Design a protein around this motif. Structure first.
Motif, PDB file in Angstrom:
ATOM      1  N   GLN A  47       0.799  -1.219   0.000  1.00  0.00           N
ATOM      2  CA  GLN A  47       0.000   0.000   0.000  1.00  0.00           C
ATOM      3  C   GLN A  47       0.833   1.270   0.000  1.00  0.00           C
ATOM      4  O   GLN A  47       0.416   2.270  -0.584  1.00  0.00           O
ATOM      5  N   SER A  48       2.000   1.260   0.639  1.00  0.00           N
ATOM      6  CA  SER A  48       2.821   2.452   0.768  1.00  0.00           C
ATOM      7  C   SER A  48       4.279   2.100   0.516  1.00  0.00           C
ATOM      8  O   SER A  48       4.697   0.952   0.675  1.00  0.00           O
ATOM      9  N   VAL A  49       5.048   3.107   0.116  1.00  0.00           N
ATOM     10  CA  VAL A  49       6.486   2.973  -0.082  1.00  0.00           C
ATOM     11  C   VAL A  49       7.173   4.122   0.639  1.00  0.00           C
ATOM     12  O   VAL A  49       6.841   5.288   0.409  1.00  0.00           O
ATOM     13  N   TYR A  50       8.132   3.800   1.499  1.00  0.00           N
ATOM     14  CA  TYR A  50       8.839   4.792   2.290  1.00  0.00           C
ATOM     15  C   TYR A  50      10.325   4.717   1.988  1.00  0.00           C
ATOM     16  O   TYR A  50      10.877   3.628   1.828  1.00  0.00           O
ATOM     17  N   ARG A  51      10.971   5.877   1.911  1.00  0.00           N
ATOM     18  CA  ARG A  51      12.422   5.944   1.793  1.00  0.00           C
ATOM     19  C   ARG A  51      12.931   7.033   2.721  1.00  0.00           C
ATOM     20  O   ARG A  51      12.501   8.185   2.619  1.00  0.00           O
ATOM     21  N   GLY A  52      13.831   6.669   3.627  1.00  0.00           N
ATOM     22  CA  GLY A  52      14.405   7.613   4.567  1.00  0.00           C
ATOM     23  C   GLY A  52      15.903   7.706   4.362  1.00  0.00           C
ATOM     24  O   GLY A  52      16.537   6.760   3.893  1.00  0.00           O
ATOM     25  N   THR A  53      16.471   8.857   4.722  1.00  0.00           N
ATOM     26  CA  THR A  53      17.881   9.096   4.438  1.00  0.00           C
ATOM     27  C   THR A  53      18.476  10.100   5.413  1.00  0.00           C
ATOM     28  O   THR A  53      17.959  11.212   5.556  1.00  0.00           O
ATOM     29  N   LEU A  54      19.562   9.702   6.073  1.00  0.00           N
ATOM     30  CA  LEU A  54      20.426  10.592   6.833  1.00  0.00           C
ATOM     31  C   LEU A  54      21.632  10.943   5.975  1.00  0.00           C
ATOM     32  O   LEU A  54      22.108  10.108   5.199  1.00  0.00           O
ATOM     33  N   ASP A  55      22.145  12.162   6.124  1.00  0.00           N
ATOM     34  CA  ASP A  55      23.339  12.570   5.403  1.00  0.00           C
ATOM     35  C   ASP A  55      24.416  12.999   6.389  1.00  0.00           C
ATOM     36  O   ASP A  55      24.124  13.390   7.522  1.00  0.00           O
ATOM     37  N   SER A  56      25.674  12.903   5.952  1.00  0.00           N
ATOM     38  CA  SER A  56      26.785  13.399   6.754  1.00  0.00           C
ATOM     39  C   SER A  56      26.868  14.916   6.758  1.00  0.00           C
ATOM     40  O   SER A  56      27.570  15.479   7.604  1.00  0.00           O
ATOM     41  N   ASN A  57      26.180  15.584   5.836  1.00  0.00           N
ATOM     42  CA  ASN A  57      26.074  17.035   5.845  1.00  0.00           C
ATOM     43  C   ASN A  57      25.115  17.539   6.915  1.00  0.00           C
ATOM     44  O   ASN A  57      25.019  18.753   7.121  1.00  0.00           O
ATOM     45  N   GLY A  58      24.412  16.639   7.597  1.00  0.00           N
ATOM     46  CA  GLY A  58      23.487  17.006   8.645  1.00  0.00           C
ATOM     47  C   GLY A  58      22.028  16.985   8.262  1.00  0.00           C
ATOM     48  O   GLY A  58      21.177  17.176   9.136  1.00  0.00           O
ATOM     49  N   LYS A  59      21.705  16.743   6.996  1.00  0.00           N
ATOM     50  CA  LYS A  59      20.337  16.831   6.508  1.00  0.00           C
ATOM     51  C   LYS A  59      19.668  15.462   6.510  1.00  0.00           C
ATOM     52  O   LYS A  59      20.287  14.447   6.165  1.00  0.00           O
ATOM     53  N   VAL A  60      18.399  15.448   6.906  1.00  0.00           N
ATOM     54  CA  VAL A  60      17.584  14.245   6.924  1.00  0.00           C
ATOM     55  C   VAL A  60      16.442  14.433   5.937  1.00  0.00           C
ATOM     56  O   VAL A  60      16.027  15.556   5.636  1.00  0.00           O
ATOM     57  N   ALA A  61      15.946  13.317   5.415  1.00  0.00           N
ATOM     58  CA  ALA A  61      14.903  13.387   4.405  1.00  0.00           C
ATOM     59  C   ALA A  61      14.046  12.136   4.468  1.00  0.00           C
ATOM     60  O   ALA A  61      14.529  11.051   4.808  1.00  0.00           O
ATOM     61  N   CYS A  62      12.770  12.302   4.133  1.00  0.00           N
ATOM     62  CA  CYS A  62      11.833  11.194   4.054  1.00  0.00           C
ATOM     63  C   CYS A  62      10.947  11.380   2.833  1.00  0.00           C
ATOM     64  O   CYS A  62      10.695  12.504   2.395  1.00  0.00           O
ATOM     65  N   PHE A  63      10.483  10.261   2.285  1.00  0.00           N
ATOM     66  CA  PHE A  63       9.633  10.281   1.101  1.00  0.00           C
ATOM     67  C   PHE A  63       8.648   9.129   1.203  1.00  0.00           C
ATOM     68  O   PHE A  63       9.063   7.966   1.192  1.00  0.00           O
ATOM     69  N   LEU A  64       7.360   9.446   1.305  1.00  0.00           N
ATOM     70  CA  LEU A  64       6.309   8.450   1.470  1.00  0.00           C
ATOM     71  C   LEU A  64       5.328   8.562   0.315  1.00  0.00           C
ATOM     72  O   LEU A  64       4.671   9.595   0.152  1.00  0.00           O
ATOM     73  N   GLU A  65       5.228   7.501  -0.479  1.00  0.00           N
ATOM     74  CA  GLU A  65       4.262   7.403  -1.566  1.00  0.00           C
ATOM     75  C   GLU A  65       3.159   6.456  -1.119  1.00  0.00           C
ATOM     76  O   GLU A  65       3.393   5.254  -0.963  1.00  0.00           O
ATOM     77  N   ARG A  66       1.964   6.996  -0.900  1.00  0.00           N
ATOM     78  CA  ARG A  66       0.843   6.249  -0.354  1.00  0.00           C
ATOM     79  C   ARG A  66      -0.214   6.077  -1.434  1.00  0.00           C
ATOM     80  O   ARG A  66      -0.699   7.064  -1.998  1.00  0.00           O
ATOM     81  N   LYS A  67      -0.581   4.829  -1.701  1.00  0.00           N
ATOM     82  CA  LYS A  67      -1.522   4.488  -2.765  1.00  0.00           C
ATOM     83  C   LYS A  67      -2.912   4.366  -2.154  1.00  0.00           C
ATOM     84  O   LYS A  67      -3.313   3.290  -1.706  1.00  0.00           O
TER      85      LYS A  67
END
Ligand SMILES: CCCCCCCCCCCCCC(=O)OC[C@H](COP(=O)(O)OCCN)OC(=O)CCCCCCCCCCCCC
Lengths: 50, 42, 307, 35, 37, 307, 35, 37, 50, 42
Positions: free
Chosen positions: F245-265
């Protein structure tokens, strides 16, 4: 003094840790909750079918 | 000079006066750590 | 005086409640924001109301990075405090001498700017609502008041129409003379409470006209109108779709922009909320997302919250 | 051709009357869902 | 110079009080009109 | 010859897919965006794939305001055309002579800037993969080549490991000598395909090393380290949670930035998606929301989509 | 105290090796939900 | 000046071809090494 | 000529009205669809209980 | 202006060429308006 510097550093690191934790967890929380709800619904559908 | 003395104490102490009064009126009266923590761990 | 009671007149709402049902319920101006926002509030007691709140924000000008707050609302007393990073302190206290007469004090210190406090005193009789607000009250060495004074009076002409005034006096320093202004207020409630009209003509020349209609038990609609030589105007139409799962608010503006605010209650406690705006005359966007995690502090209240 | 503040106040007034006629009309009654 | 603004403000306040009193008594005149109706 | 087949090697993927698992499949660099985005794609024929697509966007610099595209794909041929507001047509045509040999041409006009095209020839043998690409080919009056060319070779030394090279020659104008650069490529695959490792040293001194792990049937993880006198380095650690039903991708960076991406069907056709990134080195945020609407073109596919 | 390009290269390499150990470790296996 | 640049580009291409050939023959040498051990 | 100007104006107004329509509809549509699904599940629960 | 004719053809006809291929290889073979419409009106 050093007490104020330690206090502000601890507060800032706590704030950034909390923001990252909840920003990466709340989408996980809701997606996993939806998946678990769908799985349980499917299980009760099997139970009522059989 | 009374107002100058009050300037800092009232600033720092308006919040926990309300916290203490609510705690006194609270039935179970949880501790300070529970009072400030956003977790429902009670 | 007996014939006054013989007219069965009803109490009109407060002046701050004159157009609450449009500018707060149907329109999203007070609810809109920008960027990401997380609200973490917990309730410790219900019968005497007592609950705290943490607020984290990022990317929003109006909201601060972190703000703590705590409120207590008993039968007659209401106290609220708010501490914000950079140590800004806000406080509200409402004390009710009686169900009709209420006193309020609002205090705000930004820790680097002069403390701003306002004293409110309101009295809602059986037929008319009066109130007085004093902003930064002060008296000169000669005994002359210095500050901002507002005195508003609203009287119900008939059980379907109320008319009233609002006067304001301003004395910035005492050396400069204090200005005076008078504004007119009118409110027409339908005989069946289906629709409401409300019009105000302020002292500066601007006119505000609002209409509200309850289409069904789940839908509301409204139009607001503002118009201020230099004369400029604006007309905003809006609707609110309220359900038992989510709430939606959508408004069109006469300045060629559209807005949307959808609060989605995924869980009884956790509630996500999204808001977006498109500006076509400038071709820009504004996006905001956030969550509210309303939790508890007592085990029995946990059971009540969960059912 | 006026292009005066009177013109924009007239346009706004037309907006208000059209909007109130729209809402009071059964058009918005049909617009809201039956459920 | 400022004196003129002083009396202008006080007449404004007096007029506001007068219309406030008129609004206070307004239901009686409206009752008279509906009696005439 | 006979012993070469007796070694029993396998064909490794092309050079472009060396970081497919950790750069495109796990990390959200390719999928992230900003502002709002609506995609409306409908499909007419399935066995020979044929579909059109409309894209609206506001608030993102990379994406255009309105774009249209169409694609066709038979057994051995693939064609795609694209049109954008300001009329910048793009076109890709991949013809496959066999299942192994593919000649593809990419073209993109700019309408005010020189139209740019590239041509790739790809060969995949039993145990090695070669590809030769040219960007803006041009011949001088003397018959010498003038342009950019990249020839890459990848040979699997053992069923678990592949080594390769790539050589790039750039000739900007012909008056100035063209420069050449060679890059080294290494890939390792675990015996059970549990984890993949990839490491490539670039001609510009940059080193890329990325590891990918398949934790379970629904999740996976990756870590990538890049380095580039002026020496700068970065390292991103990310995870993917895929569900029905859903796809999630999370990411930490060494530059200090965090990110998330959730595609919900939400529906078999509708699919909303949200992306959010917070950078703590300057305390800023990027939010993006959009929807994808997938539709059929004939009744048979329309009923097939629902079931 | 060096604050050199060698310092950032070493820190990036250490972070890569630590991440590889964390990913290969069973801890990141239990981090994946069982369902 | 640029002549050395042309020579170094040519020798880079030459060593690229050499290492490509060595990589192509590498599986057999690895097989022989395994056979020896 | 006038044809190009008319085409550009028509396309721009179509784009604006389409983006307004979908921005104010998709949240509404998803909210009402979720409500309808919840009402359907509640009706199913009521009928199986009765 | 045959050169400019071909120059503008290479721009304005690449999308119609793909659409023509898709329409020819499809079974339903709809009209141009439905081909260019994002609606499911089929
Ligand atoms: C510093 C601290 C930061 C705190 C950050 C916290 C981040 C939390 C944000 C979570 C957002 C998750 C987004 C998402 O996909 O959630 C979907 C959500 C709820 O949907 P349900 O799972 O209940 O759906 C069930 C079926 N109806 O649905 C919604 O809520 C509605 C979203 C709808 C999006 C629609 C987009 C509009 C399209 C615009 C197109 C314009 C084109 C120009």
């Amino acid at each position: 003094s050093f007490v104020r510097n330690a206090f502000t550093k601890s507060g800032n690191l706590a704030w950034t840790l909390t923001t990252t934790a909840l920003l990466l967890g709340v989408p996980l929380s809701l997606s996993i909750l939806a998946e678990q709800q769908l799985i349980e619904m499917e299980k009760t559908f099997d139970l009522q079918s059989d | 000079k009374i107002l100058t003395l009050t300037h800092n104490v009232a600033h720092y102490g308006w919040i926990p006066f309300v916290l203490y009064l609510g705690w006194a009126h609270t039935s179970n009266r949880p501790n300070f750590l529970n009072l400030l923590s956003p977790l429902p761990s009670v | 005086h007996s014939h006054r009671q013989s007219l069965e007149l009803v109490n009109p709402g407060t002046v701050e409640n004159l157009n609450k049902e449009v500018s707060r319920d149907v329109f999203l101006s007070q609810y809109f924001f920008t960027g990401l926002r997380a609200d973490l509030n917990k309730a410790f007691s219900m019968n005497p109301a007592f609950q705290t709140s943490h607020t984290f924000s990022i990317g929003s000008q109006a909201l601060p990075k972190y703000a703590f707050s705590a409120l207590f609302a008993n039968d007659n007393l209401f106290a609220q405090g708010n501490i914000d990073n950079d140590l800004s302190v806000s406080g509200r206290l409402n004390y009710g001498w009686d169900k009709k007469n209420i006193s309020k004090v609002n205090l705000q210190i930004s820790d680097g700017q002069p403390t701003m406090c306002q004293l409110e005193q309101d009295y809602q009789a059986s037929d008319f609502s009066v109130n007085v607000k004093t902003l930064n009250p002060s008296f000169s060495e000669k005994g002359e008041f210095t500050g901002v004074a507002v005195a508003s009076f609203l009287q119900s002409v008939t059980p379907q129409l109320a008319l009233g005034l609002e006067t304001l006096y301003s004395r910035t320093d005492g050396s400069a003379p204090g200005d005076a202004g008078v504004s007119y207020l009118t409110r027409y409630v339908s005989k069946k409470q289906d629709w409401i009209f409300s019009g105000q003509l302020q002292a500066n020349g601007a006119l505000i006209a609002s209409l509200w209609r309850k289409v069904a038990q789940n839908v509301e609609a409204g139009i607001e109108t503002t118009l201020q030589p230099t004369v400029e105007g604006s007309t905003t139409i809006g609707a609110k779709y309220e359900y038992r799962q989510s709430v939606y608010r959508g408004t069109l503006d006469s300045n060629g922009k559209v807005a949307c605010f959808l609060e989605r209650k995924v869980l009884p406690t956790l509630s996500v909320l999204f808001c977006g705006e498109i500006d076509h005359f400038k071709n820009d966007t504004k996006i905001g997302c956030g969550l509210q995690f309303e939790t508890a502090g007592n085990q029995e209240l946990l059971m009540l919250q969960q059912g | 051709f006026k292009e005066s503040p009177l013109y924009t106040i007239a346009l706004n007034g037309a907006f208000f009357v059209a909007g109130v006629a729209f809402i009071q009309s059964p058009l918005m009654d049909m617009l809201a869902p039956q459920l | 110079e400022k004196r003129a603004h002083q009396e202008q403000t006080e007449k404004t306040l007096k007029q506001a009080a007068y219309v406030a009193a008129f609004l206070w008594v307004s239901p009686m005149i409206w009752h008279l009109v509906k009696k005439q109706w």
